[PDB]
Description:
The protein is an alpha/beta fold. It has 5 helices and 11 strands. The radius of gyration is 16 Å and the shape is globular. The termini are far apart. The PDB classes it as metal binding protein. The entry lists the keywords Deubiquitinating enzymes, JAMM domain, ESCRT complexes, Lus63-linked polyubiquitin chains, metal binding protein.
Amino acid sequence: KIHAYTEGGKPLRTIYLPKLLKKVFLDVVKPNTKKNLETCGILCGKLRQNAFFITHLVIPLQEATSDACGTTDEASLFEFQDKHNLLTLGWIHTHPTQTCFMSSVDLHTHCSYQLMLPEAIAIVMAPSKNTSGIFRLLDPEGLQTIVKCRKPGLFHPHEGKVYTMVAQPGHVREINSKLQVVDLR
Ligand SMILES: [Zn+2]
Ligand SMILES: [Zn+2]
């Protein structure tokens, strides 16, 4: 039995993550990584008995670059999530050649995730360098920094420690659960 807490003491509910998810996602977006392109996908699922279970990897309509990859139809995703009663628990994306780390845009993106949902996680694939990582912002020091950060330019550095890695064991907990990929493209 694990109880995890935030930098400021808020308790963190567990997130159950399918062991298959990471490689399945890497497979689904292989067309972009072999083409050296960033591909993101949304981690959805249910609140059941005070924990979150990730049940769906939703791949949104998106615009992929070598360095970022936002969603480009937020409405089709919301329809889909509303239809199937699916909360957002985080997201995952590929760094095709780059290392395993949270880029500057990656922290601004995750910031609005972790604001909606304190437990939210960002998963990062580095398929060339053969690494992955599950990250979150520091709560509150790191959210504070990124909410105050209206500074410009998309690789802009950040003051002090901004993000960290969900720990092992943690509030993220890998299990052998079934998995559904939903490709919205
Ligand atoms: Zn990134
Ligand atoms: Zn910034």
